[PDB]
Amino acid sequence: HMMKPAKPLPKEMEEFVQSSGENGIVVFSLGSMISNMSEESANMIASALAQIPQKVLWRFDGKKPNTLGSNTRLYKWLPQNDLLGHPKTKAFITHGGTNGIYEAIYHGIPMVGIPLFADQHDNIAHMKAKGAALSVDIRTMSSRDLLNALKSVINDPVYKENVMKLSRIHH
Numbered sequence: 001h002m003m004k005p006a007k008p009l010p011k012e013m014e015e016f017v018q019s020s021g022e023n024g025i026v027v028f029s030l031g032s033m034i035s036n037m038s039e040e041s042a043n044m045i046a047s048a049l050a051q052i053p054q055k056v057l058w059r060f061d062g063k064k065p066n067t068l069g070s071n072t073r074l075y076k077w078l079p080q081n082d083l084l085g086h087p088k089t090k091a092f093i094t095h096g097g098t099n100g101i102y103e104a105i106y107h108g109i110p111m112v113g114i115p116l117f118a119d120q121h122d123n124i125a126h127m128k129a130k131g132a133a134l135s136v137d138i139r140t141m142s143s144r145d146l147l148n149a150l151k152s153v154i155n156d157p158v159y160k161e162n163v164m165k166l167s168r169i170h171h
């Protein structure tokens with residue numbers, strides 16, 4: 001692995017991240033297929049995210065979900081790598097592209113994959129077998145299923161321990 005250092009966040013974004021206190025944050029990025037899917041999918045995701053105490057930064061560019069939580073901010077662009085390096089970061093939600101999984105690995109951030117394409121399926125299945133991720137299919141699963149996965153990856157420290165083992169293979 002090359003090193004993948006983080007820089008500081010934009011000022012307004014750092015302030016939102018700090019507002020999470022001891023709860024910390026969840027980064028959902030890029031989420032690049034969500035806006036080609038139904039309004040319903042986005043609402044189901046938004047419902048799940050609204051039920052955790054963490055603040056959530058969601059890279060998103062569609063219509064605002066009607067079930068958006070007050071804990072969740074929507075951003076057309078994010079500095080994903082900088083967020084993943086932030087000490088407040090507890091979990092990463094991603095479709096499961098290679099680039100963003102390399103960054104999760106480097107920064108030691110466990111994952112909830114929302115895979116759609118073959119390579120994402122494969123990548124997330126590999127992270128899952130390593131103990132570093134859980135997965136949901138947003139086309140078949142419920143808001144509750146995603147919520148349960150989030151709570152697990154956020155709070156059970158063994159997921160983070162398992163992803164940090166992968167950077168030391170890589171280190």
